[PDB]
Symmetry: C3
Subunit: 257 residues, 3 copies
Amino acid sequence: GAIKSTSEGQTLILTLSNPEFRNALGPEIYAAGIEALNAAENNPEIRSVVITGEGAVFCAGGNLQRLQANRREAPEVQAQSIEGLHNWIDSIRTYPKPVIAAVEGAAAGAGFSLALACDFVVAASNAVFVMSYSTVGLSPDGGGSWSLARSLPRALASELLMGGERISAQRLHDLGLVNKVASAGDALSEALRMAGQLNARAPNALASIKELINEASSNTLSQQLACERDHFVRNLHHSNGGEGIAAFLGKRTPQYR
Amino acid sequence: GAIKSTSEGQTLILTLSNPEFRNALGPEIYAAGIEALNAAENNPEIRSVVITGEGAVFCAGGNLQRLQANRREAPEVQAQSIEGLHNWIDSIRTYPKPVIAAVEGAAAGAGFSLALACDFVVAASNAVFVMSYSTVGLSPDGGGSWSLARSLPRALASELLMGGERISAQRLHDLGLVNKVASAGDALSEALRMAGQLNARAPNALASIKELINEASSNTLSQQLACERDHFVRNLHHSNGGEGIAAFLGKRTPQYR
Amino acid sequence: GAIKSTSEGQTLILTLSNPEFRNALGPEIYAAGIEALNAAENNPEIRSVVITGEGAVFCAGGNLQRLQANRREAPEVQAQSIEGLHNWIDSIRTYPKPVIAAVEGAAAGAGFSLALACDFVVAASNAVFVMSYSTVGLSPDGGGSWSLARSLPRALASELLMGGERISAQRLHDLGLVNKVASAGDALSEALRMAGQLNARAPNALASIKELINEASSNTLSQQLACERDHFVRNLHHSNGGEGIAAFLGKRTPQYR
């Protein structure tokens, strides 16, 4: 399997491609995705990232034949395959630019976990989100247990994770796990629209905001208020802070670096 | 008061019985409920638990006459009564099998707390969920403050806990605190349906999943990703992992131990 | 700018007044608001607090001209302005009485953060809630990043904080961030209604409840169960505990001190 990188304006598009296995994740997808993030990281022609599946599907999870094979191997082989995924996930989560998932058809198992790791999600109204791990005797990975257990109450998180129950794009939207529910086939275009609006915001302010959102889950309010203070003062004194305020006061469009 | 244990297939049914006091909780209910969990824990004929109230009511809370009496006693008497409840709650929360609440009529005070401690809830559409403690000059117990404060935002958690305001089964369902809203009188049957679908899943994978959901509230993502990795590798190498994958690839029904 | 204090029955009303700047927050509003809380704190004629904006607006955030000026000053000037706000916010959050926000028109930037710091919110159906910081090149303050990151899932919290996207009173209500959506111009009256119902509850029990809700975000369940036990026993033995139970058993209205 592979990741294909393209660009439209200031947004990197990463396309998961494994047509025979419905864009299944695997050790080479993890390394190419880490690489594509690393290449774009300090490149100012890129201000946001969209992750999307080639064709009619986002990602159906891992490849069940490869898992069945790693079962003949020592445990460390699978542990190592998971560390690659988990590095991908961490790298998305700490990326200093917004990452957006654009989901057509299925986002299943680690596909769903991947979509949950991004900052935003756009899903076709007929997208199928499911933690399929349970259904084949497994527990989740890609941080799917964390993302759902911490975002949702017990009952529903249990249904999704233990039950392996499908949930709709519309219902995810109503809970706040999906941003925008698009027409079948329009998820990528809608994601590029949303990414364009983010591309117009100040890069340092977005980086700061994402960092705050990350730290909130482990800070008390008091600790967060101190972090917020330091970020705020810094961003105000940054040139973008001056451009942002002056542009609003002048009724013009801010031009950020 | 008492708990009555019965079985239907692979699900234990615990029926709270205190007809004169609308299935009020109390020190003997706590001990019989701990016992019934302990007896079923390593018994493989039981793969899930349903907790339900006898008759038209789930549980209206504690018994107000007993509380009024313990007020004549040293504080330690009530503290000891609470430790029994709190052990019940902990024991549900750490039970390695899914526990499901089936709520007809009222789930009030510690009844509501109890329903929140379970992994799943099924509620009749005319069920009355309420943190009644406030209304009689008290603060909550059974973990109701935790379950609501961590699952809901400030405003609503405050309304429920400070206001003592009733909330509907439908509204709980919309927030993700209730799984299924059933017709009046059908809550138990619906819970047994849901429990049957869980009974078909792999016991070790469900145990692992519940453990992950528990640990998520106190882990960072990084810590959770490591836990997820260890559970995943273990469950893959488990015989159930092989049966689960092989059954799916073969389009047959997995048979788990 | 200023805060105007008035009373109706047992509820203090704090009115944010800065008509030229749409009730913008600033160092003198922070000190007068801290003072008004301190004065009312051990005064039993006050049992709840409503915070509201003078006129058709709640609070549009900070004053952009003052920020633009503090940009000429050393960083410490703005850091000090933020510490005043952050003390206000902390003081609301730890106040032993319920604080309710009554939002007409805009609650923007630190206005939205302020509304999120209160225990309850009542919003006119045409109220505009927005984290505007992003839009002028800034990151948030007043605990807005914490309040949203911990109450909502990633996608939606990102949209609100990074996107600077407006969200409706109705949608906040559906998520549990707003308690009551009122007719335009009725937000304050509805807040006083809700505050009246809180005024009838036992002060010590409400104080305890708010303290529990605060501590839940940093406790495990086990730690919370111990806190709940101690609060419960204390509140039962309190005279209000006896009045609360006796009043309910007697079908009369409890009279609390």
